[PDB]
From a paper:
[name] transporters consist of two identical or highly similar cytoplasmic ATPases, EcfA and EcfA′, and two transmembrane subunits, [name] and the S-component. The membrane-embedded S-component serves as both the substrate-binding and the substrate-translocation domain. The other three subunits (EcfA, EcfA′ and [name]) together form the [name] module that energizes substrate transport by the S-component. Here we report crystal structures of the group II [name] transporter for folate from [name] ([name]) in the apo-state and in complex with the slowly hydrolysable ATP analogue AMP–PNP.
We determined crystal structures of the [name]–FolT2 complex from [name] in the apo state (no nucleotides or folate) and in an AMP–PNP-bound state at 3.0 and 3.3 Å resolution, respectively. In both structures of [name]–FolT2, the ATPases EcfA and EcfA′ are in an open conformation with the subunits separated thus leaving the two ATP hydrolysis sites incomplete. The FolT2 proteins in the AMP–PNP-bound and apo complexes do not have folate bound. Nonetheless, the structure of substrate-free FolT2 is very similar to the structure of solitary, folate-bound FolT1 with root mean squared deviation values of 1.35 Å (FolT1 compared with FolT2 from the AMP–PNP-bound structure) and 1.25 Å (FolT1 compared with FolT2 from the apo structure). Although the structures of the apo and AMP–PNP-bound complexes are very similar overall, the relative orientation of the transmembrane and coupling domain of [name] is different. The coupling domains of the two complexes are in identical positions relative to the two ATPases and FolT. In contrast, the transmembrane domains are in different orientations. In the AMP–PNP structure it is packed tightly against the FolT subunit and interacts with the loops L3 and the C terminus of H5, but in the apo structure it has hinged away and the two membrane proteins interact less tightly. The position of the L1 loop in the complexes is stabilized by a hydrogen bond between the backbone carbonyl group of G35 and the highly conserved R196 (the AMP–PNP structure) or N189 (in the apo structure) in the coupling domain of [name]. The structural flexibility of the membrane domain of [name] also suggests that the interactions with loop L3 and H5 from FolT are relatively weak, in contrast to the strong hydrophobic and van der Waals interactions between the rigid coupling domain of [name] and FolT.
Author numbering:
A (entry chain D): 6 to 264
B (entry chain A): 1 to 280
C (entry chain B): 1 to 282
D (entry chain C): 9 to 173
């Protein structure tokens, strides 16, 4: 892990499909905005999405942190819009302007909006819930050669066994740290070697688990992917009308402000 | 009568192997309804028995050797229909845990049978209830103890309704708390479904409580006797590389102290009563 | 002359002593060459505590005097290596530790880089591979080519070949046949007799009674009971109120009491049980 | 190979390992030199290029979902990580162990995807010139890839035939 926690339990956070669609529809709705009332509209909806769904404001810093100073430079670069073309002149041409300032503030809100809607996608949903949604969006390509039975299987196992192989590594790490071992001493020719004492155990293990699982899967009567039911499915709850309204209302507001 | 009969079997690993057969002889039979123990030293080849039973492993010849889980004979396309009669609980619960949550692991077997979902809901919730895992139905294998993930491993088996439950090395990694708890549950699950159980190598109550005990050292079957029979085998059992259960060990140490007790005590109750008797 | 924890708490985050998180309080002291069992319900923190010994974790409150060092919440990472030659942890399922392409290179790995020479790293790996009971042709013989049992040996020889003052073992005998545990628990019982403290982390209460000089008990990160196996298993109600298991002989003794045979003293062990069954008739 | 199962579990197994090895960068002292190429080399060598490529794409998906990425999700971002194991697989699949194979396979991965495509996905949505994101890229990609060939070729080569036979 990896994060974040599904609610403890907070209100909403239901039906990853609709919320993931709302996540994808919103980042498309982040684009297609030509006015200051456009950026006003898309700002106070994604905003209203956040604290009506109530999360502590401090949890959003974790997503913004890595991209901050580069994106400041983006917004700093485009706050200077000057001489886009026809001036390869003059002296110091670049200068502060409101046109750039409002451009630079556009890019802050245009960029930061994708780290709001998407952050609440991860925070408010289990990883399997997202995967369940992901495989549903993936479905319509069944018409092509792509069988998706094994694609959904490989995903389901990796998502399942990523936690375990992690915890097995720490155990292996501390194991070699006890009889050995120092991992940080300086060198190129030197400390590439330190990877092996964790890796071979982890790879030996990961082979040992692929053995034990493939055997159990068949002793549970796994013939193949073809045509055997499903236990775990997704519903459509009553709460799912909120994101259809929230998405459909904002549509017209964004339409007016685009044009 | 017997619920499965394995004929003369020679099985090796020929890739990579053949200094030695793993078994080369065997030819044993389990009586229907009976709890049975396959016990031996590692290298007696018992570990490979349970996999040859459901067809995952195969004899060398396929002709002179015959494996039938009674009603059905291994195997060509027979294999899959055999696995409807028999299922196995392996030793490492985390490794074989196939479900996202608890109730997806108990539904996995049903899924493979194309049982439609409305019926799957009622069979799964019933199976996790039978193993005590009701409250934990939606919990995760990562967050479950080592004895809890073998209750889910067994619960996934009750959902496909096996005739034979082979415990292969299950409780290997486990505390003696959970070991008696798991076995006590299988004992219940056994006599409410009228099954045949094949348990492998925990000794103690897993063997001393079984109706039939097969000593597999080494590669071949050493005697066949009941638990009250072969555990008194002492040296011929001890020179095998094995050991003896508590009551057999406690009556042993008592003899050297001058207390001679009848060689049929399979229990604490018989021994407690025998010491209650012998105290006048 | 002891292994002393005062006054040792461990928290997984910022904390204050009111919280029950991790380890809390924990004032105790352990004798020189004793065989100390460490028992408790899963999630008591016996695992966390184990990691404090070699300072894979450092406390957030107290002090630890163990090998002659002193481990304080501010303790840095210098000189960890001279501590871990003296104090060795062996984790549950140490056959995963095997990495090296040869058994003898995998056992040498421990003594080597711990400040052994080459002459005395082979000398020790050869010493402790025969000492842990492998055939000598299994030297070389890449350790992944070995049975589950003999990998456990390689692991053990890997961590014992530099012969630490203290050795800490989480469930070392887990998953081994009944005669295997006897071999293992004797090798440690022999290693103790050589003047070395031995830590044993197990949920099996049978060989705690047989093999241990005194036991520590943890419930929710607090140390509830420190005493010898007898003083620990005396109480019927206190032992059962916490979730804790008698050794078998203690249950058969109490089982004779259900029949009323009046076994003298506290047997705890099959020889002690048979002798007090022989005494109790007479 | 029809009826592939038990090759596919290990496939997910290396999808896992690669997802794990993407978060871990060690690394020397000052220059972090992230891991996770190993997972793509592993997907490359023993699974093959047209297979590993499918894995490296799922290794964004699983990774993006769990740790709350980033990642993709968004489609042209996974193509980079899908492409990675392919090119390692292209000349290492059912192919011998040789020093000519890796140097072509390490430095190239940088240039094609790690340089060009990673540079591209940076400069597309913004006004930052492609040559600005190209500038920063050339440094990092003229230093570290030579550190991979040291660990890529030798560490893989044993594991290539250690577990193969």
């Amino acid at each position: 892990i990896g994060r974040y926690l599904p609610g403890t339990t907070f209100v909403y956070r239901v039906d990853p499909r609709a919320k993931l669609l709302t996540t994808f529809y919103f980042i498309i709705m982040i684009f297609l905005a030509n006015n200051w009332v456009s950026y006003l509209v898309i700002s106070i909806f994604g905003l209203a999405y956040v604290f009506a769904t109530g999360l502590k404001a401090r949890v959003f810093w974790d997503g913004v942190k890595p991209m901050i100073w580069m994106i400041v430079f983006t917004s700093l670069l485009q706050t200077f819009f000057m001489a886009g073309g026809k001036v390869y002149w003059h002296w110091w041409i670049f200068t502060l302007s409101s046109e750039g300032l409002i451009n630079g503030l556009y890019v802050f809100i245009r960029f930061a909006m994708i780290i709001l809607v998407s952050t609440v996608m991860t925070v408010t949903t289990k990883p399997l819930e997202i995967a369940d949604a992901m495989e549903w969006m993936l479905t319509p390509l069944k018409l092509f050669k792509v069988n998706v039975g094994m694609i959904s299987l490989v995903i389901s196992i990796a998502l399942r066994f990523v936690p375990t192989l992690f915890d097995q590594t720490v155990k292996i790490m501390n194991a070699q740290r006890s009889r050995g071992a120092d991992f940080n001493d300086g060198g190129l020719v030197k400390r590439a070697k330190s990877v092996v004492p964790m890796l071979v155990p982890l790879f030996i293990d990961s082979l040992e688990v692929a053995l034990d699982l493939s055997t159990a899967m068949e002793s549970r009567g796994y013939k193949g992917s073809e045509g055997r039911t499903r236990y775990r499915i997704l519903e459509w709850s009553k709460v799912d009308l909120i994101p259809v309204a929230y998405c459909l209302l904002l549509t017209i507001l964004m339409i007016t402000t685009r044009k | 009568g017997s619920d499965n009969i394995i004929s003369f079997d020679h099985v090796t690993f020929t890739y990579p192997d053949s200094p030695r057969p793993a078994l080369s002889d065997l030819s044993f039979a389990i009586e229907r309804g009976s709890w049975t123990a396959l016990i031996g030293h590692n290298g007696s080849g018992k570990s490979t028995v349970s996999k040859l039973i459901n067809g995952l492993l195969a004899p060398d010849d396929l002709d002179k050797s015959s494996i039938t889980v009674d009603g059905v004979k291994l195997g060509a396309d027979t294999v899959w229909e055999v696995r409807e009669k028999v299922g196995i609980v392996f030793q490492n619960p985390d490794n074989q845990f196939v479900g996202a949550t608890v109730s997806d692991d108990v539904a996995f077997g049903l899924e493979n049978r194309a049982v439609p979902r409305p019926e799957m809901l009622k069979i799964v919730a019933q199976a996790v209830a039978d193993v005590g895992m009701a409250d934990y139905a939606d919990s995760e294998p990562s967050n479950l103890s080592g004895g809890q993930k073998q209750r889910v491993a067994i619960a996934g088996i009750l959902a496909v309704k096996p005739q034979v439950i082979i415990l292969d090395e299950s409780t290997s990694m486990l505390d003696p708390e959970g070991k008696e708890q798991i076995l006590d549950l299988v004992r219940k699950i056994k006599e409410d479904n009228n099954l045949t159980v094949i348990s492998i190598t925990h000794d103690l109550e897993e063997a001393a409580g079984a109706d039939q005990v097969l000593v597999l050292d080494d590669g071949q079957l050493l005697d066949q006797g009941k638990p009250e029979e072969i555990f008194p085998k002492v040296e011929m059992l001890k020179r095998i590389g094995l050991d003896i259960p508590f009551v057999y060990r406690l009556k042993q140490l008592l003899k050297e102290r001058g207390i001679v007790l009848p060689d049929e005590i399979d229990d604490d109750e018989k021994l407690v009563q025998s010491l209650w008797q012998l105290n006048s | 002359m002891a292994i002393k924890f005062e006054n040792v708490s461990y928290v997984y985050s910022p904390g204050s002593p009111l919280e029950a998180i991790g380890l809390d309080q924990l004032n105790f002291s352990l004798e020189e060459g004793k065989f100390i069992a460490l028992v408790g319900h899963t999630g008591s923190g016996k695992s966390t505590l184990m990691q404090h010994f070699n300072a894979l974790l450092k406390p957030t409150s107290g002090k630890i005097e163990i090998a002659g060092y002193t481990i304080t919440p501010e303790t840095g990472n210098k000189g960890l290596k001279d501590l871990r030659r003296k104090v060795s942890l062996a984790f549950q399922f140490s056959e995963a530790q095997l990495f090296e392409n040869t058994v003898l290179k995998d056992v040498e790995y421990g003594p080597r880089n711990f400040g052994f020479s080459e002459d005395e790293a082979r000398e020790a790996a050869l010493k402790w591979l025969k000492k842990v009971g492998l055939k000598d042709d299994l030297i070389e013989h890449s350790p992944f080519d070995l049975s589950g049992g003999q990998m456990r040996r390689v692991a053990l020889a890997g961590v014992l070949a530099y012969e630490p003052e203290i050795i800490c073992l989480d469930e070392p005998a887990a998953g081994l046949d009944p005669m295997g545990r006897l071999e293992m628990m004797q090798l440690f019982k022999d290693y103790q007799a050589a003047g070395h403290t031995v830590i044993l982390v197990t949920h099996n209460m049978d060989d705690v009674a047989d093999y241990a000089d005194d036991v520590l008990a943890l419930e929710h990160g607090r140390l509830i009971k420190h005493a010898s196996p007898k003083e620990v298993f005396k109480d019927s109600e206190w032992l059962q109120k916490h979730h804790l298991a008698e050794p078998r002989s203690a249950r058969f003794a109490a089982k004779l009491e259900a029949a009323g045979l009046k076994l003298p003293g506290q047997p705890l062990t099959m020889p002690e049980l048979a002798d007090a069954i022989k005494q109790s008739l007479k | 190979s029809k009826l592939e199962l038990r090759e596919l579990v290990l496939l997910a197994m290396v999808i896992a390992i690669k997802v794990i090895l993407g978060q871990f960068k060690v690394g020397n002292a000052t220059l972090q030199v992230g891991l996770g190429f190993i997972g793509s080399v592993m997907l490359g060598y023993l699974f093959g290029p047209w297979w590993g490529f499918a894995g490296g794409a799922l290794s964004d998906l699983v990774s993006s979902v769990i740790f709350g990425n980033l990642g993709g999700f968004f489609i042209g971002f996974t193509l980079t990580a899908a492409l990675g194991p392919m090119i390692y697989g292209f000349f290492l699949y059912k192919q011998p162990i040789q020093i000519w194979r890796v140097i072509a396979s390490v430095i190239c991965v940088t240039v094609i995807c790690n340089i060009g495509l990673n540079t591209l996905w940076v400069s597309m949505m913004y006004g930052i010139n492609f040559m600005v994101a190209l500038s920063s890229r050339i440094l990092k990609e003229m230093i570290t890839p030579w550190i991979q060939m040291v660990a890529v070729w030798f560490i893989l080569e044993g594991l290539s035939r250690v577990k193969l036979s």
